[PDB]
Amino acid sequence: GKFDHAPISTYTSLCSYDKVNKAPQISVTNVGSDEHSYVSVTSKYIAPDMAAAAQMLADCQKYKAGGNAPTGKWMKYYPGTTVNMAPYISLNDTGSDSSRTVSVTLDKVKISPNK
Amino acid sequence: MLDAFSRVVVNSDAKAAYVGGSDLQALKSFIADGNKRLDAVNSIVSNASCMVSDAVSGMICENPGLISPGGNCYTNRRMAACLRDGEIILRYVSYALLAGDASVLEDRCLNGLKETYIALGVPTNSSIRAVSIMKAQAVAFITNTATERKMSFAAGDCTSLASEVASYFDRVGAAIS
Amino acid sequence: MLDAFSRVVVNSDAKAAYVGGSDLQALKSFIADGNKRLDAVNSIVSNASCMVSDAVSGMICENPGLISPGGNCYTNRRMAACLRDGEIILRYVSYALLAGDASVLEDRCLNGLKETYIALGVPTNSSIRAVSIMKAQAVAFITNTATERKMSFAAGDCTSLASEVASYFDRVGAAIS
Ligand SMILES: *C(=C)C1=C(C)[C@@H](Cc2[nH]c(/C=C3N=C(/C=C4\NC(=O)[C@H](C)[C@H]4[C@@H](*)C)C(C)=C\3CCC(=O)O)c(CCC(=O)O)c2C)NC1=O
Ligand SMILES: *C(=C)C1=C(C)[C@@H](Cc2[nH]c(/C=C3N=C(/C=C4\NC(=O)[C@H](C)[C@H]4[C@@H](*)C)C(C)=C\3CCC(=O)O)c(CCC(=O)O)c2C)NC1=O
Ligand SMILES: *[C@@H](C)[C@H]1/C(=C/C2=NC(=C\c3[nH]c(C[C@H]4NC(=O)C(C=C)=C4C)c(C)c3CCC(=O)O)/C(CCC(=O)O)=C2C)NC(=O)[C@@H]1C
Ligand SMILES: *[C@@H](C)[C@H]1/C(=C/C2=NC(=C\c3[nH]c(C[C@H]4NC(=O)C(C=C)=C4C)c(C)c3CCC(=O)O)/C(CCC(=O)O)=C2C)NC(=O)[C@@H]1C
Ligand SMILES: *[C@@H](C)[C@H]1/C(=C/C2=NC(=C\c3[nH]c(C[C@H]4NC(=O)C(C=C)=C4C)c(C)c3CCC(=O)O)/C(CCC(=O)O)=C2C)NC(=O)[C@@H]1C
Ligand SMILES: *[C@H](C)[C@H]1/C(=C/C2=NC(=C\c3[nH]c(C[C@H]4NC(=O)C(C=C)=C4C)c(C)c3CCC(=O)O)/C(CCC(=O)O)=C2C)NC(=O)[C@@H]1C
């Protein structure tokens, strides 16, 4: 299972080569005993799984052959990629006055098949 | 900071930003009854999924021809695209409430919607019906008078914003009339 | 002990961290709302496998150009890299919920990430779709409103934590824009 990783120079801004792709690995375990339950945390190297990613492309072929959308000379009213884009807003009421936050983000809108 | 939100909305590509507590206080000083206004916007977006599907189905409920063969909500793909259009309109109304200014609704959403639908063949008179349903939906949630759900809010009066959202919905119908 | 957790996630010498029965309740004493917060991270991490694949897949169907020739998720090699990126990002924000602070998320992950995607040519629009789906997935699990699975918890309100996870995912989007 050999994978050709990208050149080091392309991510010098991010992090050093000996620490890239290491991310937290967290396991939380419940048991009725407060004297025996535990939590564990570690950093592990997340390698790419070619086997899953081969499956992903095979499943997504269905969307590749269902068209994209109609178009016309009215497209001038959607000058960027903003066709079917709307602003999404998030609001965070919480138990601390400084921890409150708000968000606004322009993004595409689509309806999942279950609705 | 509200300009930064405007810069996010207008940039013509996907983009994100957020408000921290220090900058949130600048917004709180700038906005009139910001406590109410933010709760009002939450009341819409927290139920937007319920609102849009009911309105589109309510339009179908009173106008069954839209789902008859050749109808503009017949076959799955047209049906999703109408739900998509309902969401985008409702989202653009929600930010219009948050900014308290109707410009962004007109300039980004309502502009060209008249010319667009006719070339697509979308029945605009029924489109008005769906939007006019959401206006009934939105007013109830802001006043916390919905039948099947009640929200938790600090006591007080939200009448002004309920009237404010009403104008934003009514702008939609006029543009596509 | 909570300090020890923060050390390993910045790649210190230890293999792993552990908290015993006495120490776990000691950690829960330090972190207010510990029990719910432990429930919250458990619900996210236990479903991370489903969360990422669904989020990646949703990103593709919203823009199938990613899998067309010349598309960044075309090829078997690049597709694996993209899936990895979502797994990394979800793990970091899941830890931020455990500590209840954005410091490690901002400091260990998001700084320098924007420049790296610019160098790699990863289209920022597609990434925002990936990140935004993780948010919608995460809030559903924490509030036990997932359409397809119900988890068992003591009944109560986890709205604060769900909006607290919402803040972290918003930070990733702003950084990558
Ligand atoms: C046909 C059978 C037909 C429709 C389908 C459906 C459409 C419709 N709905 C209303 C009134 C409301 N529906 C609302 C939506 C919901 N209320 C809730 O509690 C949940 C969370 C949410 C999702 C289902 C709301 C908020 C209202 C407003 C209530 C009020 O103002 O008191 C209508 C009437 C309003 C209108 O058309 O403008 C219609 C047509 N009802 C049907 O009969
Ligand atoms: C492409 C056609 C496309 C997708 C495929 C799909 C992607 C998508 N999914 C959601 C909402 C959710 N998906 C969830 C995933 C799961 N639920 C579970 O029970 C299992 C464990 C897990 C793996 C399958 C969850 C939890 C959610 C949120 C609650 C829900 O059930 O809906 C979205 C919505 C995100 C958004 O609106 O931006 C999307 C886009 N939708 C597609 O179009
Ligand atoms: C339900 C409300 C309607 C219904 C709506 C439909 N609209 C269709 C296509 C379409 N709609 C828009 C406008 C939309 N995109 C934007 O950017 C804006 C404003 C921000 C909005 C509100 C566009 C641009 C398009 C075409 C592009 C696309 O859909 O990808 C549509 C499908 C048409 C088709 O498949 O050929 C429908 C069904 N139609 C109805 O009858 C009810 C009333
Ligand atoms: C109509 C929509 C509602 C209504 C709204 C009111 N909210 C009031 C006070 C209030 N609002 C918040 C949350 C708000 N402040 C923030 O920083 C954030 C940002 C994310 C938001 C969402 C808080 C914390 C409070 C304080 C309430 C308290 O101290 O308990 C309010 C009171 C008047 C005022 O403060 O100006 C009103 C009327 N309340 C209702 O009952 C209807 C249904
Ligand atoms: C939002 C997260 C959920 C919700 C979760 C709740 N769990 C509550 C009590 C509780 N949770 C645990 C498990 C947790 N504490 C630990 O030590 C461990 C080990 C790692 C974890 C996983 C425990 C042990 C308890 C105490 C009761 C019990 O023995 O099961 C709880 C109530 C806490 C409070 O506010 O007083 C909540 C809200 N419940 C929900 O409805 C949403 C979906
Ligand atoms: C998936 C949703 C994306 C997609 C992402 C890709 N990223 C690629 C390479 C890459 N990504 C990172 C950042 C990642 N590595 C880390 O350690 C952490 C932070 C701690 C992050 C989040 C790096 C550093 C790299 C380069 C390192 C390497 O590849 O070994 C990548 C492959 C690029 C290539 O062909 O070489 C992809 C496809 N691309 C997309 O279009 C969607 C939005």
Numbering used by the authors:
A (entry chain A): 309 to 423
B (entry chain C), C (entry chain B): 1 to 177
Lines from the paper:
Red algae utilise a megadalton-size light harvesting antenna called the red algal phycobilisome (PBS)—comprised of rod structures formed from stacked, hexameric protein-pigment rings emanating from a protein core that is poised above an integral membrane photosystem. Published cryo-EM maps for two red algal phycobilisomes contain clusters of unmodelled density homologous to the cryptophyte-αβ protomer. We modelled these densities, identifying a new family of scaffolding proteins related to red algal phycobilisome linker proteins that possess multiple copies of a cryptophyte-α-like domain. These domains bind to, and stabilise, a conserved hydrophobic surface on phycoerythrin β, which is the same binding site for its primary partner in the red algal phycobilisome, phycoerythrin α.
One additional pair of ‘lone’ PE β subunits in the P. purpureum red algal PBS is attached to the C-terminal tail of the red algal PBS rod linker protein LR610 potentially providing stability. The C-terminal domain of LR6 that binds PE β in P. purpureum forms a flat structure comprised of a β ribbon followed by an α helix. Structural alignment of the C-terminal domain of LR6 to published cryptophyte-α subunits produced RMSD values ranging from 0.744 Å over 172 atoms to 1.335 Å over 208 atoms. This provided the first evidence for the existence of a cryptophyte-α-like protein in the red algal PBS. The only obvious difference between the two structures is the absence of a chromophore-binding loop in the C-terminal domain of LR6. Examination of the deposited cryo-EM maps confirms the structural similarity seen in the deposited model. Additionally, the map density shows that the N-terminal domain of the PE β subunit (not modelled in the original structure) has adopted a fold that has previously only been seen in cryptophyte-αβ protomers. One of these clusters is LR6, which includes a second CALM domain beyond the original model. For the unmodelled region of LR6 and most of the remaining two CaRSPs, we built de novo models including models for the metamorphic N-terminal domain of the associated PE β subunits. We hypothesise that the CALM domain originated in an early LR6 rod linker, by modification of the ancestral Pfam01383 domain, which allows it to bind to the metamorphic PE β (centre).
